[PDB]
A paper describes a structure:
The condensin protein complex plays a key role in the structural organization of genomes. Based on their homology to ATP binding cassette (ABC) transmembrane transporters and the Rad50 DNA damage repair protein, the two globular ATPase “head” domains situated at the ends of ∼50-nm-long intra-molecular coiled coils of a heterodimer of condensin’s Smc2 and Smc4 subunits are thought to sandwich a pair of ATP molecules between composite catalytic sites, each composed of Walker A (P loop) and Walker B motifs of one head and a so-called ABC signature motif of the opposite head. Each head domain (hd) can be subdivided into a “RecA”-like lobe that contains the ATP-binding pocket and a “helical” lobe that merges into the coiled coils; they connect the heads to a half-doughnut-shaped “hinge” dimerization domain.
To gain functional insights into the condensin ATPase cycle, we solved the crystal structures of Smc2hd and the Smc4hd-Brn1C complex of the thermophilic yeast Chaetomium thermophilum (Ct) to 2.6- or 3.0-Å resolution, respectively. These motions displace strictly conserved glutamine residues in the Smc2 and Smc4 Q loops, which are thought to coordinate the catalytic Mg2+ ion and contribute to nucleotide binding.
Author numbering: 1 to 51, 61 to 220, 983 to 1177
The structure:
Amino acid sequence: MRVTELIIDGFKSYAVRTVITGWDESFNAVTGLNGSGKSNILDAICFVLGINLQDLIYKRGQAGVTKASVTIVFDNRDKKRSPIGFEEYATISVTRQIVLGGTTKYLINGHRAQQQTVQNLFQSVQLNINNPNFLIMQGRITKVLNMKPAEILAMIEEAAGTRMFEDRKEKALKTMAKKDLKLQEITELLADEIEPKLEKLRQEKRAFLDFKKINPKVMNMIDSVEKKEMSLKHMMKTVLKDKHKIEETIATLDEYKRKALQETWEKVNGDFGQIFNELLPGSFAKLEPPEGKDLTDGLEVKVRLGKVWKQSLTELSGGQRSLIALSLIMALLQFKPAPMYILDEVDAALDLSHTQNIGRLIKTRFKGSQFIVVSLKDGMFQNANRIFRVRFSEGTSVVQALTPAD
């Protein structure tokens, strides 16, 4: 499902009921540097999705407005991507409301719904509200640029799905820990408790036969502890074989983990360089282990600016660093896909041509997903199919909808 309509009423700078309609299925751009209305559109979308709420009302809500409502209207004609249990609806609308005191209620298609129902709806179409895989904000770019090689790898390990192997390896390690401990309990009991009692007992019997009393049950005590020895010694050789079996299992786990990480590394590395080449024509990039280490020890971003390999991301300009981090983020979207993606103010250091390159990539390489790009600066992302310009007029934010190529 994709967005077709956004209705904001009494929410933040939208004092009056405001309907923003005609959202494109592929590439939308929300602009408006001055004022708060442009960013308020994103806050309204995040509010319905579920990312002191009385402050979100028009005046918190000390002035006239005392109720706030936001409604997202989804097109649901593509039944293949329809949320399960809602296939009959050609259109699904989710509404969230605020009243004084900051309590909220949800509506689905005009009928009251539980919050869990709305959350289960969004997560059924891979809009992970709890861990947003669809929200690319400026902080994510800054975070990626400062990631150490171990953290870059962790990003790749997640896409490879190697937690599968790591959970198994953690189980076997707890198992082999109990096995290892068992031999220590055996060796303590055997060497320090069973073997001394047995040789002392054989010594008493060896004092008695020599030319007086011996314990009548000495024959039995000998045979009793002699059996306990043969049982412990065989357990030694058995628990060790279990320990060997776990080691061979873990090595097979690590091998399949390494091979799965290798396939994901090559897939990401290929897309990452091509995406960066599209966003910054004439340049290239790759993920490579740091000088001297291995894949298991982490991955590192190497950038070729023009014909020059750069030693550090530190050496890149502001715009080049944003494009490098955005290229890596976009190269990983395929592993946790979403029907909708939101790009929030990543264009501070960018030129117009860079935003045009991002826009072309959205319409082609990422065709099949709906992109909403909230621009920071005006006049960016001009090749968007639908552009919503926010201004402020008569105490409320007003949105002008445009369709380039008229």
